[PDB]
Design a binder for this molecule. Structure first.
Ligand SMILES: [Cl-]
Length: 261
């Protein structure tokens, strides 16, 4: 039995839900309290009876505040994760710096008095929008123990990601003119190792801002990816393999079936 499974057996509806099965609470990390990042909000399940949970850090993009990705916090955490949505040190920080800040936010959770006993510090993930998604890739390249990475309309000058060993879901926006998929998202996906567990999901008709307000497709597949890889939860592979049929997805590529033990 997989000791990391949390919550009831899933359905398409359960992964689409705005609130998942876990009631959540939150705590604020002030900029002063944060070492190596700009502060954030931690969302976490209050129920401890199923065990500890994986941890996820989420970064905004260039010029943007935490508020641009805040909706992801409770939507993911309520599926059984401890999630920190960060501010960066400055809004004009570059991608590799954002990756260091994502790692610093995860490291902060290890000693945070509200959540340190609620996390499994060995099961961590990174996500981010725009340069924050470039940051997520950067963090994975620097810390191969990360269990998942999810760049949302990622932006990075570095196009080569052959060193990544963290299962990665690359989410592109079809009509993105800021981080166009041909030069950013698709290039990142094509340079990830061919033997990595990975997927590329392009959002039909979407602009760069699709991640900045609730988007069910983004949420549902982020949830499924984090479950599958942070929790090793094979109940969630059904949503990822074979290719999803959602209207909102204009293209899907993957290395299905994914590896497991
Ligand atoms: Cl755009």
């Amino acid at each position: 039995a997989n000791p990391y499974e949390r919550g009831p057996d899933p359905t398409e509806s359960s992964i689409e839900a705005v609130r998942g099965p876990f009631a959540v609470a939150q705590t604020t990390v002030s900029r002063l309290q944060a070492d190596g990042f700009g502060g954030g909000t931690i969302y976490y399940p209050t129920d401890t009876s199923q065990g500890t949970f994986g941890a996820v850090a989420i970064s905004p993009g260039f010029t943007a505040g935490q508020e641009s990705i805040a909706w992801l916090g409770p939507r993911i955490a309520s599926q059984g994760f401890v999630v920190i949505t960060i501010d960066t040190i400055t809004r004009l920080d570059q991608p590799d710096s954002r990756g260091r800040q994502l790692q610093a936010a995860l490291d902060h959770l290890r000693t945070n008095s509200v959540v340190r006993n609620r996390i499994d510090p060995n099961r961590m993930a990174v996500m981010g929008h725009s340069m924050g998604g470039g940051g997520a890739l950067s963090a994975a390249a620097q810390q191969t123990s990360l269990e998942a990475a999810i760049p949302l309309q990622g932006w990075h000058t570095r196009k080569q990601w052959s060193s990544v060993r963290t299962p990665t879901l690359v989410v592109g926006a079809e009509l993105d003119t800021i981080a166009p998929v041909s030069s950013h998202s698709e290039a990142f996906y094509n340079s990830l190792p061919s033997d990595l567990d990975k997927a590329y999901m392009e959002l039909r008709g979407a602009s760069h801002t699709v991640s900045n307000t609730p988007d069910t497709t983004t949420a549902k597949y982020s949830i499924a990816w984090l479950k599958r890889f942070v929790d090793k939860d094979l109940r969630y592979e059904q949503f990822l393999c074979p290719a999803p049929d959602d209207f909102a997805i204009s293209e899907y590529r993957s290395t299905c079936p994914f590896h497991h033990h």
